[PDB]
Scaffold this active site. Structure first.
Site, short mmCIF file in Angstrom:
data_model
loop_
_atom_site.label_atom_id
_atom_site.label_comp_id
_atom_site.label_asym_id
_atom_site.label_seq_id
_atom_site.Cartn_x
_atom_site.Cartn_y
_atom_site.Cartn_z
CB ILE A 71 -3.05 0.17 13.92
CG1 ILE A 71 -2.34 -0.39 14.98
CG2 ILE A 71 -3.91 1.51 14.55
CD1 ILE A 71 -1.76 -0.06 15.38
CD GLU A 160 6.11 -3.11 12.17
OE1 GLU A 160 6.18 -4.08 12.00
OE2 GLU A 160 6.18 -2.13 11.55
NE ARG A 163 2.99 -6.36 10.19
CZ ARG A 163 3.16 -5.02 10.55
NH1 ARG A 163 3.31 -4.49 10.91
NH2 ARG A 163 1.79 -4.45 9.55
N1 LIG Z 1 -0.77 1.57 10.72
C1 LIG Z 1 0.00 0.70 10.67
N2 LIG Z 1 -0.10 -0.29 11.31
C2 LIG Z 1 1.01 -1.34 10.83
N3 LIG Z 1 1.67 -1.67 10.66
C3 LIG Z 1 2.55 -0.20 10.02
N4 LIG Z 1 3.47 -0.50 10.14
C4 LIG Z 1 3.67 1.17 8.92
N5 LIG Z 1 2.41 1.48 9.21
C5 LIG Z 1 1.78 0.72 10.05
#
Ligand SMILES: Nc1ncnc2[nH]cnc12
Ligand SMILES: *[C@@H]1O[C@H](CO)[C@@H](O)[C@H](O)[C@H]1NC(C)=O
Length: 246
Positions: A71, A160, A163
Protein backbone atom coordinates in the site's frame (compact mmCIF):
# COMPACT_ATOMS: atom_id res chain seq x y z
CA UNK A 1 -10.30 -1.79 -9.50
CA UNK A 2 -11.50 -3.98 -6.62
CA UNK A 3 -14.04 -3.02 -3.97
CA UNK A 4 -15.14 -4.07 -0.50
CA UNK A 5 -18.17 -2.88 1.51
CA UNK A 6 -18.29 -3.27 5.28
CA UNK A 7 -22.05 -2.72 5.32
CA UNK A 8 -23.49 -6.25 5.22
CA UNK A 9 -20.04 -7.80 5.11
CA UNK A 10 -19.64 -11.39 6.14
CA UNK A 11 -16.92 -14.03 5.82
CA UNK A 12 -18.14 -14.88 2.31
CA UNK A 13 -18.16 -11.30 0.96
CA UNK A 14 -14.72 -10.64 2.50
CA UNK A 15 -13.48 -13.88 0.91
CA UNK A 16 -14.79 -12.58 -2.44
CA UNK A 17 -12.91 -9.27 -2.00
CA UNK A 18 -9.62 -11.03 -1.17
CA UNK A 19 -10.10 -13.28 -4.23
CA UNK A 20 -10.70 -10.15 -6.41
CA UNK A 21 -7.61 -8.51 -4.92
CA UNK A 22 -5.35 -11.50 -5.71
CA UNK A 23 -6.89 -11.76 -9.20
CA UNK A 24 -6.15 -8.11 -9.95
CA UNK A 25 -2.43 -8.72 -9.58
CA UNK A 26 -0.79 -9.60 -12.90
CA UNK A 27 1.49 -12.61 -13.39
CA UNK A 28 2.99 -14.41 -16.37
CA UNK A 29 4.25 -17.49 -14.52
CA UNK A 30 3.33 -19.71 -11.53
CA UNK A 31 6.06 -21.24 -9.46
CA UNK A 32 4.98 -24.41 -7.71
CA UNK A 33 1.43 -23.45 -8.68
CA UNK A 34 1.67 -20.07 -6.97
CA UNK A 35 1.41 -16.90 -8.99
CA UNK A 36 4.73 -15.12 -9.43
CA UNK A 37 4.32 -11.34 -9.20
CA UNK A 38 6.00 -9.32 -11.97
CA UNK A 39 9.56 -7.88 -11.65
CA UNK A 40 8.19 -4.46 -12.64
CA UNK A 41 5.33 -2.66 -14.34
CA UNK A 42 5.68 0.78 -15.95
CA UNK A 43 3.45 3.80 -15.54
CA UNK A 44 0.02 4.00 -13.94
CA UNK A 45 -0.45 0.27 -14.54
CA UNK A 46 1.77 -0.47 -11.54
CA UNK A 47 -1.05 0.60 -9.20
CA UNK A 48 -4.23 -1.15 -8.26
CA UNK A 49 -7.02 0.96 -6.71
CA UNK A 50 -9.00 -0.65 -3.90
CA UNK A 51 -12.28 1.03 -3.10
CA UNK A 52 -13.16 0.47 0.54
CA UNK A 53 -16.44 1.50 2.12
CA UNK A 54 -17.13 1.78 5.82
CA UNK A 55 -20.40 0.65 7.40
CA UNK A 56 -21.91 4.12 6.81
CA UNK A 57 -20.96 3.98 3.15
CA UNK A 58 -18.11 6.52 3.28
CA UNK A 59 -15.14 5.59 1.16
CA UNK A 60 -11.38 5.69 0.70
CA UNK A 61 -9.42 4.54 -2.35
CA UNK A 62 -6.19 2.74 -1.58
CA UNK A 63 -3.28 2.58 -4.06
CA UNK A 64 -1.51 -0.77 -4.14
CA UNK A 65 1.70 -1.59 -6.08
CA UNK A 66 0.82 -4.77 -8.06
CA UNK A 67 4.41 -6.02 -8.03
CA UNK A 68 4.64 -6.33 -4.24
CA UNK A 69 1.13 -5.72 -2.83
CA UNK A 70 2.47 -2.66 -1.00
CA UNK A 71 0.00 0.00 0.00
CA UNK A 72 1.52 3.31 -1.09
CA UNK A 73 -1.17 5.89 -0.27
CA UNK A 74 -4.88 6.50 -0.32
CA UNK A 75 -7.46 9.11 -1.23
CA UNK A 76 -10.06 10.32 1.28
CA UNK A 77 -12.59 12.82 -0.14
CA UNK A 78 -10.41 15.40 -1.96
CA UNK A 79 -7.14 14.76 -0.11
CA UNK A 80 -4.45 12.23 -1.05
CA UNK A 81 -2.04 10.78 1.54
CA UNK A 82 1.24 8.99 0.79
CA UNK A 83 3.88 7.35 2.87
CA UNK A 84 7.15 9.24 3.33
CA UNK A 85 9.32 7.03 1.11
CA UNK A 86 10.60 7.17 -2.49
CA UNK A 87 8.28 4.42 -3.82
CA UNK A 88 5.25 6.30 -2.49
CA UNK A 89 6.47 9.59 -3.88
CA UNK A 90 6.77 7.88 -7.29
CA UNK A 91 3.25 6.48 -6.89
CA UNK A 92 2.00 10.02 -6.27
CA UNK A 93 2.98 10.85 -9.85
CA UNK A 94 0.39 8.38 -11.15
CA UNK A 95 -2.53 8.08 -8.71
CA UNK A 96 -5.03 10.54 -7.21
CA UNK A 97 -3.65 13.37 -9.33
CA UNK A 98 -7.00 15.15 -9.16
CA UNK A 99 -6.93 15.44 -5.30
CA UNK A 100 -7.16 19.09 -4.17
CA UNK A 101 -4.15 18.58 -1.83
CA UNK A 102 -1.51 15.97 -1.12
CA UNK A 103 -0.34 15.17 2.39
CA UNK A 104 2.80 13.19 2.96
CA UNK A 105 2.37 11.10 6.09
CA UNK A 106 5.16 11.63 8.68
CA UNK A 107 6.39 8.03 8.39
CA UNK A 108 7.25 5.44 5.80
CA UNK A 109 4.96 2.42 5.25
CA UNK A 110 6.94 -0.38 6.80
CA UNK A 111 5.83 -2.09 9.97
CA UNK A 112 8.75 -0.83 12.07
CA UNK A 113 7.96 2.87 11.42
CA UNK A 114 4.20 2.46 11.57
CA UNK A 115 4.37 0.72 14.96
CA UNK A 116 6.58 3.54 16.26
CA UNK A 117 4.06 6.19 14.99
CA UNK A 118 1.11 4.23 16.42
CA UNK A 119 2.79 3.76 19.81
CA UNK A 120 2.14 0.01 19.76
CA UNK A 121 3.30 -3.17 18.03
CA UNK A 122 1.02 -5.26 15.81
CA UNK A 123 0.82 -7.87 18.55
CA UNK A 124 -1.33 -5.46 20.57
CA UNK A 125 -3.65 -4.05 17.85
CA UNK A 126 -6.94 -5.96 17.33
CA UNK A 127 -7.75 -6.74 13.71
CA UNK A 128 -10.91 -7.93 12.00
CA UNK A 129 -13.74 -6.54 9.93
CA UNK A 130 -14.93 -4.17 12.72
CA UNK A 131 -11.37 -2.86 13.01
CA UNK A 132 -11.23 -2.37 9.24
CA UNK A 133 -14.46 -0.31 9.41
CA UNK A 134 -12.79 1.81 12.14
CA UNK A 135 -9.62 2.15 10.11
CA UNK A 136 -11.55 3.45 7.07
CA UNK A 137 -13.34 5.95 9.29
CA UNK A 138 -10.07 7.09 10.85
CA UNK A 139 -8.37 7.65 7.51
CA UNK A 140 -11.25 9.86 6.33
CA UNK A 141 -9.98 12.69 8.54
CA UNK A 142 -6.30 13.30 8.96
CA UNK A 143 -4.75 12.35 12.27
CA UNK A 144 -1.23 11.02 11.78
CA UNK A 145 -1.01 9.06 15.05
CA UNK A 146 -4.52 7.53 14.64
CA UNK A 147 -3.76 6.88 10.96
CA UNK A 148 -0.66 4.76 11.81
CA UNK A 149 -2.80 2.27 13.74
CA UNK A 150 -5.53 2.40 11.09
CA UNK A 151 -2.89 1.67 8.46
CA UNK A 152 -1.54 -1.35 10.40
CA UNK A 153 -5.11 -2.68 10.44
CA UNK A 154 -5.67 -1.86 6.77
CA UNK A 155 -2.41 -3.52 5.61
CA UNK A 156 -3.06 -6.78 7.52
CA UNK A 157 -6.71 -7.10 6.51
CA UNK A 158 -6.02 -6.46 2.78
CA UNK A 159 -2.42 -7.07 1.57
CA UNK A 160 -1.49 -9.72 4.17
CA UNK A 161 -4.78 -11.65 3.67
CA UNK A 162 -4.15 -11.54 -0.10
CA UNK A 163 -0.64 -13.02 0.47
CA UNK A 164 -1.63 -15.84 2.85
CA UNK A 165 -4.80 -17.93 2.96
CA UNK A 166 -4.20 -18.47 6.70
CA UNK A 167 -4.39 -14.69 7.30
CA UNK A 168 -7.53 -14.41 5.16
CA UNK A 169 -9.12 -17.14 7.34
CA UNK A 170 -8.01 -15.35 10.53
CA UNK A 171 -9.84 -12.20 9.38
CA UNK A 172 -12.91 -14.22 8.45
CA UNK A 173 -12.93 -15.55 12.01
CA UNK A 174 -12.93 -11.89 13.06
CA UNK A 175 -15.89 -10.83 10.94
CA UNK A 176 -17.95 -9.63 13.93
CA UNK A 177 -15.34 -9.50 16.76
CA UNK A 178 -11.80 -8.10 16.62
CA UNK A 179 -8.86 -9.93 18.04
CA UNK A 180 -5.08 -9.29 18.06
CA UNK A 181 -3.32 -11.33 15.30
CA UNK A 182 -2.15 -14.84 16.26
CA UNK A 183 1.62 -15.18 16.54
CA UNK A 184 1.46 -17.47 13.44
CA UNK A 185 -0.13 -14.53 11.56
CA UNK A 186 2.70 -12.22 12.70
CA UNK A 187 5.28 -14.85 11.70
CA UNK A 188 3.84 -15.21 8.16
CA UNK A 189 3.71 -11.45 7.67
CA UNK A 190 7.37 -11.16 8.59
CA UNK A 191 8.34 -14.11 6.37
CA UNK A 192 6.72 -13.37 3.03
CA UNK A 193 9.78 -12.07 1.23
CA UNK A 194 11.94 -14.88 2.68
CA UNK A 195 9.41 -17.53 1.68
CA UNK A 196 8.93 -15.99 -1.74
CA UNK A 197 12.69 -16.14 -2.26
CA UNK A 198 13.13 -19.74 -1.05
CA UNK A 199 10.22 -21.06 -3.20
CA UNK A 200 11.81 -19.49 -6.23
CA UNK A 201 15.29 -20.88 -5.30
CA UNK A 202 13.72 -24.33 -4.80
CA UNK A 203 13.15 -24.36 -8.58
CA UNK A 204 16.52 -25.77 -9.62
CA UNK A 205 17.12 -27.19 -6.17
CA UNK A 206 14.70 -30.11 -6.38
CA UNK A 207 12.06 -28.30 -4.33
CA UNK A 208 14.51 -27.80 -1.41
CA UNK A 209 14.99 -24.35 0.18
CA UNK A 210 18.57 -23.06 0.01
CA UNK A 211 17.91 -21.58 3.47
CA UNK A 212 15.20 -22.84 5.89
CA UNK A 213 12.45 -20.38 6.84
CA UNK A 214 11.51 -20.30 10.54
CA UNK A 215 7.78 -19.85 11.31
CA UNK A 216 5.40 -20.01 14.28
CA UNK A 217 2.55 -22.54 13.80
CA UNK A 218 -1.16 -22.44 14.80
CA UNK A 219 -0.44 -24.17 18.13
CA UNK A 220 2.13 -21.44 18.95
CA UNK A 221 5.13 -23.68 18.22
CA UNK A 222 8.16 -22.60 16.17
CA UNK A 223 8.94 -24.62 13.00
CA UNK A 224 11.47 -24.85 10.16
CA UNK A 225 10.18 -24.80 6.55
CA UNK A 226 12.76 -26.56 4.39
CA UNK A 227 11.00 -27.56 1.18
CA UNK A 228 7.97 -27.00 -1.10
CA UNK A 229 6.02 -29.96 0.39
CA UNK A 230 5.34 -27.80 3.46
CA UNK A 231 1.70 -26.85 4.04
CA UNK A 232 2.88 -23.19 4.04
CA UNK A 233 3.83 -23.68 0.38
CA UNK A 234 1.09 -26.09 -0.77
CA UNK A 235 -1.88 -24.59 1.06
CA UNK A 236 -1.15 -21.10 2.40
CA UNK A 237 0.96 -18.61 0.48
CA UNK A 238 -1.03 -17.22 -2.48
CA UNK A 239 1.44 -14.80 -4.21
CA UNK A 240 5.23 -14.72 -4.65
CA UNK A 241 7.35 -11.61 -4.41
CA UNK A 242 9.60 -11.81 -7.47
CA UNK A 243 13.27 -12.35 -6.41
CA UNK A 244 14.16 -9.43 -8.69
CA UNK A 245 12.48 -7.32 -5.98
CA UNK A 246 14.23 -9.06 -3.04
N1 LIG B 1 2.52 -0.49 3.30
C1 LIG B 1 2.47 -1.85 3.25
N2 LIG B 1 1.70 -2.49 2.33
C2 LIG B 1 1.66 -3.86 2.28
N3 LIG B 1 2.35 -4.64 3.13
C3 LIG B 1 3.14 -4.13 4.09
N4 LIG B 1 3.89 -4.66 5.07
C4 LIG B 1 4.45 -3.63 5.75
N5 LIG B 1 4.07 -2.45 5.24
C5 LIG B 1 3.22 -2.68 4.21
C1 LIG C 1 10.35 -31.62 3.62
O1 LIG C 1 9.51 -31.10 4.64
C2 LIG C 1 8.91 -32.05 5.53
C3 LIG C 1 8.11 -31.30 6.60
O2 LIG C 1 7.28 -30.33 6.00
C4 LIG C 1 9.95 -32.94 6.21
O3 LIG C 1 9.37 -33.87 7.11
C5 LIG C 1 10.74 -33.68 5.13
O4 LIG C 1 11.69 -34.53 5.76
C6 LIG C 1 11.36 -32.65 4.16
N1 LIG C 1 12.01 -33.28 3.03
C7 LIG C 1 13.23 -32.89 2.62
C8 LIG C 1 13.80 -33.60 1.43
O5 LIG C 1 13.86 -32.00 3.19
Amino acid sequence: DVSFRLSGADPSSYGMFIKDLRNALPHTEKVYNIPLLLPSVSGAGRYLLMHLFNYDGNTITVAVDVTNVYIMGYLALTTSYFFNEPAADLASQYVFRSARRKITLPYSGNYERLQIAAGKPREKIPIGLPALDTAISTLLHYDSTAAAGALLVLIQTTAEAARFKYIEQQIQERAYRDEVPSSATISLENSWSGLSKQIQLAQGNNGVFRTPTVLVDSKGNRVQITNVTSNVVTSNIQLLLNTKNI
